[PDB]
């Protein structure tokens, strides 16, 4: 089948350069134009340009004139976009797709985060209900996963057992570090007689936390 695989997420420094690959399969690579599309966190979709792997011709969006650079390796069936002079506003998901007038084959995309932060592991804080307004039938417990870099962290409860009642919120930036929270709801039968645990994993840092929600007795 027609496969379009892109390269993994990248975290780069401002003013650096990144090279993003789009590997192709299941077709004659040289035949079709590879398109490049940029998608900024909720901002539509922008056509950056395209490249014909056979000839080498390359059309760029006016707006993208000396920031994007398409090349192609016909031997290995890979197109490349180079982004130069990174600025924060270059942070977005980028897609390759096979040209056909319409795009029916899309690579899975590559996320680019432009930033001066560095691998920082999270601080994981247990949120246990206050002595007030705790009382109810269900109970909502929470986990604060604060100041990590870069995305993503993984949050599961009771090592994947608690799958119902869980809400994991989108991380927000707070001084160039990320913060996220997750809430699980459970019947007041379980906690605190049933140990609820918040598991957080941060690959980038090689951090694994098992953070239990103890009662606020202290």
């Amino acid at each position: 089948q027609v496969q379009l695989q892109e390269s993994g997420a990248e975290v780069m420094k401002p003013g650096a350069s990144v090279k993003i690959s789009c590997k192709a399969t299941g077709y004659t690579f040289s035949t079709y134009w590879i398109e490049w599309v940029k998608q900024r966190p909720g901002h539509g979709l922008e056509w950056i340009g395209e490249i014909l792997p056979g000839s080498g011709s390359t059309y760029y969006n006016e707006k993208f004139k000396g920031k994007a650079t398409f090349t192609a390796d016909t031997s290995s069936n890979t197109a490349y976009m180079q982004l130069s002079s990174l600025t924060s506003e270059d942070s977005a998901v980028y897609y390759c797709a096979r040209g056909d007038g319409n795009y029916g084959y899309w690579g899975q995309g590559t996320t680019l985060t432009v930033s001066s932060a560095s691998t920082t592991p999270p601080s994981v804080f247990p949120l246990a209900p206050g002595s007030a307004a705790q009382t109810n039938s269900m109970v909502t417990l929470g986990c604060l996963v604060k100041g990590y870099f870069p995305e993503p962290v993984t949050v599961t409860w009771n090592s994947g057992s608690l799958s119902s009642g869980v809400h994991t919120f989108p991380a927000v930036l707070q001084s160039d570090l990320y913060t996220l929270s997750s809430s699980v709801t459970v019947p007041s039968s379980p906690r605190p007689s049933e140990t609820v645990t918040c598991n957080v994993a941060h690959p980038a840092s090689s951090t694994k936390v098992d953070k239990k929600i103890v009662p606020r007795d202290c």
Partner: protein, 214 residues
């Protein structure tokens, strides 16, 4: 450039209803216009190519018509999985261009948020920081005013709000609201309140705690 304008920007839709989305061009593009569906944090999926042609594997409920400057995507009977972003694109000239997008959401029956407030953990407080968390879970509509109060006086500085996507199962939303303070800023007050105004009530949903109470 050929500016592609789509309307409406968002659409609240009860399942079983029929919608029509519009895509207009700033100059005629003949039959060069295709429709994509994008689901959150997934690549776009082509649904219709060259105004009206159909691709294998796309549900028959989707169809397009139009020509020149006016295009339409019609979903005869919106299903629940039809939630997402709807893009049009012109392949008439360079550069290639997309529409703004029309976001489609599933209309449900009102649901009142479930509000919970959490005081700073001691462990965090040792770091000398205090984050006050409020979860407002499973509500519809998406409209909601959250307001923080300290010793009854409102506070606007220091609040970060995060939202989950319209949920797949029940079509409800969830938000979390964090109030971040210095440890010393926290200890200068007693009562912290999280108050939600949702259309499912005349009077605010209030949750608070007393810093001191253990």
């Amino acid at each position: 450039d050929i500016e592609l304008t789509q309307s409406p920007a968002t659409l609240s839709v009860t399942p079983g209803d029929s919608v029509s989305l519009s895509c207009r061009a700033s100059q005629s593009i003949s039959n060069n216009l295709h429709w994509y569906q994008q689901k959150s944090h997934e690549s776009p999926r082509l649904l219709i190519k060259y105004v009206s042609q159909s691709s294998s594997g796309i549900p028959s409920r989707f169809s397009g018509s139009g020509s020149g400057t006016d295009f339409t995507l019609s979903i005869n009977s919106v299903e629940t999985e039809d939630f997402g972003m709807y893009f049009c694109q012109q392949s008439n000239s360079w550069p290639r261009t997309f529409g703004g997008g029309t976001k489609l959401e599933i209309k449900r029956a009102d649901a009142a948020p479930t509000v919970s407030i959490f005081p700073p953990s001691s462990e965090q407080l040792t770091s000398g920081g205090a984050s006050v968390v409020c979860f407002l879970n499973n509500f519809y509509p998406k409209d909601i005013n959250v307001k923080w109060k300290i010793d009854g006086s409102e506070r606007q500085n220091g609040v970060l709000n995060s939202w989950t996507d319209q949920d797949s199962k029940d079509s409800t939303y969830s938000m979390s609201s964090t109030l971040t303070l210095t440890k010393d800023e926290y200890e200068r007050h007693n009562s912290y309140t999280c108050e939600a105004t949702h259309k499912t009530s005349t009077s605010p949903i209030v949750k608070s705690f007393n810093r001191n109470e253990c």
